[PDB]
Design a protein around this ligand. Structure first.
Ligand SMILES: OC[C@H]1O[C@@H](O)[C@H](O)[C@@H](O)[C@@H]1O
Ligand SMILES: OC[C@H]1O[C@@H](O)[C@H](O)[C@@H](O)[C@@H]1O
Ligand SMILES: OC[C@H]1O[C@@H](O)[C@H](O)[C@@H](O)[C@@H]1O
Lengths: 125, 126
């Protein structure tokens, strides 16, 4: 139920404790790198970070954040299981979550899955 | 923020049934009747206010639970139990636990321990 997500740059997705934007910048999966996968119905998932708040696509208007008190939507994603065992996340605007290779804060405004939009993942506690 | 859904491990959501008859854990998706506002009911306990503005009642375990009480007394106060596996359970004032009954019958509050049907995944929704 709780997972981490490892980006194209081998770092781990970081909630940043809900302060500012999320980054794919952590060397190891610790507390801020763990997300509870929420079954939001109709095949959609949400992600609840270490702070008990929810990940938002921000509709691509700014880098993604983990600060929402409740799920609606911008907070539900398609979980895409790629052939190589990786995962991609499709936001409500139809765009994909991108690690941006750790070069900037995580975004959800790219319309296609390339390398920066594939995450390795595992259940952990 | 304080409005939540409860998903039983049959993967269905707890349903207020709009206050008509007993509550069931039978909804495929969390919509209006599946949202419950968590109300501080004092002394660390909580109440659950359903879509119809009325409160969830354990009925003291003597019949299936309902969501029709206009005000809080009790059979309407519960312990919110944070389980180690990230799920939650709800302890009625009779010491028993809310059970999904695997969706095979209406929801109950008369089992004395947390087992498989008494753990719920939860999230705050709008
Ligand atoms: O508590 C652990 C957290 O502490 C922070 O200082 C680190 O940047 C996070 O990566 C880590 O998850
Ligand atoms: O309802 C669509 C979206 O509206 C925005 O103003 C909120 O920031 C999002 O959290 C929400 O999902
Ligand atoms: O949309 C409001 C409600 O409609 C009913 O027909 C369904 O059984 C509920 O699950 C739902 O919440």
């Amino acid at each position: 139920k709780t997972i981490w997500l490892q980006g194209f740059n081998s770092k781990y997705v970081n909630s940043r404790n809900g302060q500012g934007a999320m980054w794919c910048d952590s060397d190891t999966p610790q507390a801020w790198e763990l997300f509870t996968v929420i079954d939001a119905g109709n095949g959609k998932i949400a992600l609840r970070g270490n702070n008990g708040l929810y990940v938002s696509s921000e509709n691509g208007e700014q880098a993604m954040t983990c600060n929402r008190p409740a799920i609606n939507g911008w907070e539900v994603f398609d979980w895409i299981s790629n052939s190589d065992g990786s995962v991609s996340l499709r936001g409500s605007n139809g765009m994909y979550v991108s690690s941006e290779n750790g070069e900037q804060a995580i975004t959800c405004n790219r319309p296609a899955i390339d390398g920066w939009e594939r995450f390795n993942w595992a259940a952990a506690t």
